Design an enzyme around this catalytic site. Structure first.
Site, mmCIF file in Angstrom:
data_model
loop_
_atom_site.group_PDB
_atom_site.id
_atom_site.type_symbol
_atom_site.label_atom_id
_atom_site.label_comp_id
_atom_site.label_asym_id
_atom_site.label_seq_id
_atom_site.Cartn_x
_atom_site.Cartn_y
_atom_site.Cartn_z
ATOM 1 N N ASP A 334 0.927 -1.142 -0.166
ATOM 2 C CA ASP A 334 0.050 -0.095 -0.059
ATOM 3 C C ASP A 334 0.923 1.440 -0.113
ATOM 4 O OD1 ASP A 334 -0.631 1.960 2.253
ATOM 5 O OD2 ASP A 334 -2.524 1.354 2.459
ATOM 6 N N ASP A 668 -7.024 -2.366 3.252
ATOM 7 C CA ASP A 668 -6.393 -3.546 3.073
ATOM 8 C C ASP A 668 -6.929 -4.855 3.672
ATOM 9 O OD1 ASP A 668 -4.565 -1.193 3.383
ATOM 10 O OD2 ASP A 668 -3.741 -1.859 1.757
HETATM 11 N N1 ADP Z 1 -10.597 12.025 4.945
HETATM 12 C C1 ADP Z 1 -10.975 12.079 3.645
HETATM 13 N N2 ADP Z 1 -12.038 12.619 3.077
HETATM 14 C C2 ADP Z 1 -12.097 12.519 1.992
HETATM 15 N N3 ADP Z 1 -11.451 12.234 1.019
HETATM 16 C C3 ADP Z 1 -10.279 11.673 1.483
HETATM 17 C C4 ADP Z 1 -9.916 11.612 2.586
HETATM 18 N N4 ADP Z 1 -8.741 10.779 2.785
HETATM 19 C C5 ADP Z 1 -8.412 10.484 1.645
HETATM 20 N N5 ADP Z 1 -9.317 10.979 0.600
HETATM 21 C C6 ADP Z 1 -9.255 10.663 -0.762
HETATM 22 O O1 ADP Z 1 -9.727 9.547 -0.901
HETATM 23 C C7 ADP Z 1 -9.025 8.595 -1.409
HETATM 24 C C8 ADP Z 1 -9.299 7.300 -1.211
HETATM 25 O O2 ADP Z 1 -8.413 6.734 0.067
HETATM 26 P P1 ADP Z 1 -8.029 5.246 0.267
HETATM 27 O O3 ADP Z 1 -8.693 4.406 -0.815
HETATM 28 O O4 ADP Z 1 -8.241 5.090 1.646
HETATM 29 O O5 ADP Z 1 -6.544 5.294 0.043
HETATM 30 P P2 ADP Z 1 -5.305 6.193 0.512
HETATM 31 O O6 ADP Z 1 -5.977 6.807 1.687
HETATM 32 O O7 ADP Z 1 -3.804 5.363 0.551
HETATM 33 O O8 ADP Z 1 -5.176 7.342 -0.544
HETATM 34 C C9 ADP Z 1 -7.618 9.189 -1.262
HETATM 35 O O9 ADP Z 1 -6.733 8.558 -2.055
HETATM 36 C C10 ADP Z 1 -7.706 10.594 -1.296
HETATM 37 O O10 ADP Z 1 -7.555 11.221 -2.702
HETATM 38 F F1 ALF Z 2 -2.213 3.309 -0.575
HETATM 39 AL AL1 ALF Z 2 -3.676 2.659 0.687
HETATM 40 F F2 ALF Z 2 -4.900 2.157 1.797
HETATM 41 F F3 ALF Z 2 -3.118 3.793 1.940
HETATM 42 F F4 ALF Z 2 -3.998 1.621 -0.739
HETATM 43 MG MG MG Z 3 -4.230 2.959 4.828
#
Ligand code: ADP
Ligand code: ALF
Ligand code: MG
Ligand code: NAG
Length: 959
Positions: A334, A668
């Site tokens: 990740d 994950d």
């Molecule tokens: N707290 C939040 N509120 C809204 N959108 C969010 C928030 N945190 C992350 N995001 C957006 O939504 C996406 C989805 O996050 P996620 O699938 O958990 O993967 P990651 O956190 O690794 O990017 C993020 O990549 C970001 O663009």
């Molecule tokens: F990169 Al992620 F949840 F933090 F897929």
């Molecule tokens: Mg994460």
């Protein structure tokens, strides 16, 4: 008449029906429902000790050993029987301890009970019951720091809960009231209104209600916390288990056992010993071939590795999986909180004047009062802990950057009131009306906010740039939005877009708060893009370079934008600067258009493929034939939903790749469980989230999980191959005696089996792993040509010295011949027994040292220490005894030999055999290439990934 599943009983329940269930009946309904469902208690059976022993003793080996003890007692070799029982006793004690420990950890997690306040249909009882909680019970939740016993949909109020154990999610999770509706959907199907069993409640508050009240859904230990512990009990098996391949190798030994038995029968028939007597000799020959200390030795290997990992911090469950670690071929990772660093500085915000984007403000504080400031301050779901604020590292860093401060505990449905900094060169403090939570799959969050100005309420939505820009009405959306964002994503700044809509509702009204999530997130005006900065964890860059150097491929699976994931991937060394990256893109098949796959290269100063989540969706549904080609060539899977991460794991597995997952998030959780080796890097102590929980927040764990696995797989193969070598060395020794005057030993056999072999066997399993992960994969079949060769060639050398000894002994001019007229137990002293035992004793020790072969997967033998001391000590005792048995002569039944010369000849033969054994194993390592080249010049693996790779090498994807 016919039993119905509890899930089947409560699968079709309405949104309204969960509210109908709230204020359920106090007792009569409770009792009948509780009787039907069964008691709300974890189903781990509790055993005093003897309860376990009866079950434990049913193993088939135990029966054979019990029969053997009786047989040896009938032969009147009591001493060998005294050992054979004792070794089995150690085996059963260690198996009992192993089994007891494995259950105890799981039982200790699920051993929690506390008094619970339960709501009657016209009542609010306090501390009434816990283990008897009714399947549809409605309860008022505790104010602060309260563990939740059951999976219950929250009917009224809002909850802040720590789900760290359940979801791998350390950060606090917001919980909200369920909406009653004609439609039936499960609380789990909502996946948010449900409050999960065994999850701590940080705080619980009802804006409108007197207190937070929840109605139980799926319960009785069969769902959530227990559902996963229940998984750990009677666990899922691994296909093509190597023990089957070892069982085939046992059949090769079974031929030798039969050949020995017929050889014995001819010798006994020639000897003219009584037929009744010959049966005992044949039975002894078969029982000797069975190794007594092998079953224990197999347990001690795993228990030592669990011990080795517990000290490293990689807390383990299903210890059988540590060997599976040894074989893993790809490790999925990740992006955020694993490959990068958790916690991120806000690198300013970009505002838009009209359609056009204005220049970026370094510090969010210096910006005009209006929508963007309010949205930046209010969008988060942060709550106030004791003298502090608690939230997601991103949302926390944003609000601290604004400079606005969250108000404390002190209208109706008004919550998380935001106080201004109150520095001027308007303060206008703002209050949230409705909060919408963030889901990884959903990829956005929203809030409805109102101010003392008392205008039309404004809805603010913070989310992923593509989805938020897409959701926005194309009035404010800039022409070059994509190109401008591309600057920020290509730089490697995690970007979240904020969109504002003025909402035509009555301000500061509870009723007005009630709204459709889609209707709030419908027509939108793009406001600005946040520019969050996440930096690479120092150790990530090293480990990936080693895993790539070993040729275990690293795939990146992320929910973030493809360019950011490409920048992180290019940074870590998933994709090296020499290597070439292609962005596979797909167009949706719909209306008059069929499905189109377009491959566009990216150029930056092994044909690696990067695919967005949606493209992979179209590839799996509408290009099934192409999926093998992309999944065997794809390194940076990006914009993936939580479900998609499981699909990559499952498709990569069906291609015969051994997958691994080192994620640290709720997203994950699915992929970690599905993957062969799953590691959750942020968890504390043992947890059900992953097989191999870690407490170090780095990728430095993953090399250690492989390195120990390869050691455990080589230890398993070394201990098995030494146990075979010992049994055949015993077989040759006992036979040489059986031909020659029908003699054996009693106290001698206890000494060899109990002290020389059992001590060496247990102690050889604690060497520990090699320093550096290696190119060569650990050998995976016990019935291999090298292993079979090594054992057969060594046994010839064993016999050579053993026979040589007897010829030398008989040839000795002082030598007095034997009896060959009286029974083996009756002839307590035999001149041959002295020589054969004395030569064989040392060679049993030598085998372990030659077998150890500690280099590629294990450290050098000396580093062990307890083994090395024991080897030297037993060797010294044996050297002492062979030169001068003294007192021990009597117990050993040794025939005293005065002549020094023959003793030195005997010591010489053992030294020669020792040199021989070491030479043979070194020769075996050197000889393998020549053997392999001649035996097979070229071969093609049945596994699909190795073929698809070879095909792609012959003809690449269109360049
Ligand atoms: N707290 C939040 N509120 C809204 N959108 C969010 C928030 N945190 C992350 N995001 C957006 O939504 C996406 C989805 O996050 P996620 O699938 O958990 O993967 P990651 O956190 O690794 O990017 C993020 O990549 C970001 O663009
Ligand atoms: F990169 Al992620 F949840 F933090 F897929
Ligand atoms: Mg994460
Ligand atoms: C060896 O043992 C026999 C017993 O059968 C006894 O006569 C004597 O001790 C020795 N002599 C012979 C006969 O082998």
């Amino acid at each position: 008449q016919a039993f119905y599943q509890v899930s089947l009983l409560d699968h079709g329940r309405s949104c309204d029906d969960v509210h109908r269930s709230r204020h359920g009946l106090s007792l009569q309904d409770q009792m009948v429902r509780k009787a039907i469902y069964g008691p709300n208690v974890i189903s781990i059976p509790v055993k005093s000790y003897p309860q376990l022993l009866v079950d434990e003793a049913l193993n088939p080996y135990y029966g054979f050993q019990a029969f053997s003890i009786a047989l040896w007692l009938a032969d009147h070799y009591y001493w060998y029987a005294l050992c054979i029982f004792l070794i089995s006793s150690i085996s059963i004690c260690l198996s009992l301890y192993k089994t007891r420990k494995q259950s105890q950890t799981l039982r200790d997690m699920v051993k929690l009970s506390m008094r619970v306040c339960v709501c009657r249909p016209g009542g609010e009882e306090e501390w009434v019951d816990s283990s008897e909680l009714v399947p549809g019970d409605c309860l008022v939740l505790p104010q602060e720091g309260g563990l939740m016993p059951c999976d219950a949909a929250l009917v009224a109020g809002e909850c802040m809960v720590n789900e760290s154990s359940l979801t791998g999610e350390s950060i606090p999770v917001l919980k909200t009231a369920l909406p009653e509706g004609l439609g039936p959907y499960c609380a789990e199907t909502h996946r948010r209104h449900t409050l999960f069993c065994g999850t701590l409640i940080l705080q619980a508050r009802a804006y409108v209600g007197p207190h937070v009240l929840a109605v139980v859904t799926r319960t009785g230990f069969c769902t959530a916390k227990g559902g996963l512990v229940s998984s750990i009990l009677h666990p899922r098996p691994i296909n093509f288990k190597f023990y089957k391949h070892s069982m085939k190798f046992v059949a090769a030994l079974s031929v030798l056992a039969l050949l020995g038995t017929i050889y014995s029968i001819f010798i006994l028939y020639r000897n003219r010993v009584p037929l009744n007597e010959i049966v005992i000799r044949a039975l002894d020959l078969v029982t000797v071939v069975v190794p007594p200390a092998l079953p224990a030795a197999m347990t001690v290997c795993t228990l030592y590795a669990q011990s080795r990992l517990r000290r490293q911090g990689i807390f383990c469950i299903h210890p059988l999986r540590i060997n599976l670690g040894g074989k893993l071929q790809l490790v999925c990772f990740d992006k955020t909180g694993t490959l990068t660093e958790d916690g991120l500085d806000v690198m300013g915000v970009v505002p838009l004047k009209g359609q056009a984007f204005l220049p970026l403000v370094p510090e969010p504080r210096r910006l005009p009062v209006g929508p963007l400031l309010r949205a930046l301050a209010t969008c988060h779901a942060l709550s106030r802990l004791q003298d502090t604020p608690v939230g997601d590292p991103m949302d926390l860093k944003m609000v601290e950057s604004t400079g606005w401060v969250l108000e404390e505990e002190p209208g109706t449905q008004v919550l998380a009131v935001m106080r201004p900094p109150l520095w001027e060169p308007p303060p206008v403090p703002v209050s949230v009306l409705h909060r919408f939570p963030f889901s990884s799959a959903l990829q956005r969050m929203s809030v409805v906010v109102a101010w003392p100005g008392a205008t039309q309420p404004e809805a603010y939505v913070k989310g992923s740039p593509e989805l938020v820009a897409g959701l926005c009405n194309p009035e404010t959306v800039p022409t070059d939005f994509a190109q401008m964002l591309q600057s920020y994503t290509a730089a490697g700044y995690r970007v979240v877009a904020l969109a504002s809509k003025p909402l035509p509702t009555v301000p500061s009204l509870e009723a007005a708060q009630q709204l459709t999530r889609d209707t709030v997130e419908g027509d939108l005006s793009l406001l600005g893009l946040l520019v969050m900065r996440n930096l690479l964890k120092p150790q990530t860059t090293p480990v990936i370079q080693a895993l790539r150097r070993t040729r275990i491929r690293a795939v990146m699976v992320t929910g973030d934008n493809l360019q950011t994931a490409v920048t992180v991937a290019r940074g870590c060394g998933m994709v090296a600067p020499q290597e070439h990256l292609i962005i596979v893109h797909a167009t949706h098949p719909e209306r008059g258009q069929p499905a189109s796959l377009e491959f566009l290269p990216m150029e930056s100063p092994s044909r690696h493929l990067a695919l967005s989540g949606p493209t992979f969706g179209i590839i799996v549904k509408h290009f099934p034939k192409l999926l093998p080609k992309v999944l065997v060539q794809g390194t940076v899977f990006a914009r993936m939903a939580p479900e998609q991460k499981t699909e990559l794991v499952c498709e990569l597995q069906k291609l015969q790749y051994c997958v691994g997952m080192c994620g640290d998030g709720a997203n994950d959780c699915g992929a970690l469980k599905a993957a062969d080796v799953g590691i959750s890097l942020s968890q504390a102590e043992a947890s059900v989230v992953s097989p191999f929980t870690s407490s170090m927040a780095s990728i430095e764990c993953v090399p250690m999980v492989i390195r120990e696995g390869r050691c455990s797989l080589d230890t398993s193969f070394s201990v098995f191959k030494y146990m075979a070598l010992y049994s055949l060395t015993q077989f040759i020794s006992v036979l040489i005696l059986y031909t020659i005057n029908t003699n054996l030993g009693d106290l001698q056999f206890l000494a060899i089996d109990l002290v020389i072999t059992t001590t060496v066997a247990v102690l050889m399993s604690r060497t520990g792993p090699a320093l550096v992960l290696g190119r060569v994969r650990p050998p995976g079949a016990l019935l291999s040509v090298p292993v079979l060769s090594s054992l057969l060639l060594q046994m010839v050398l064993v016999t050579g010295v053993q026979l040589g000894g007897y010829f030398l002994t008989l040839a000795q001019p002082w030598f007095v011949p034997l009896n060959r007229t009286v029974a083996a137990p009756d002839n307590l002293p035999n001149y041959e027994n002295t020589v054969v035992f004395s030569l064989s004793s040392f060679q049993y020790l030598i085998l372990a040292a030659a077998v150890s072969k500690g280099a590629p997967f294990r450290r050098p033998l000396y580093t062990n220490v307890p083994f090395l001391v024991a080897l030297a000590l037993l060797s010294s005792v044996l050297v002492g005894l062979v030169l001068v048995p003294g007192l021990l002569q009597g117990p050993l039944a040794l025939r005293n030999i005065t002549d020094t010369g023959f003793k030195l000849l005997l010591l010489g033969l053992v030294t020669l055999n020792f040199v021989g054994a070491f030479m043979l194993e070194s020769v075996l390592d050197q000889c393998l290439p020549a053997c392999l080249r001649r035996l097979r010049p070229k071969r093609a693996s049945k596994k699909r990934f190795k073929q698809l790779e070879r095909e792609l090498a012959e003809q690449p994807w269109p360049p």
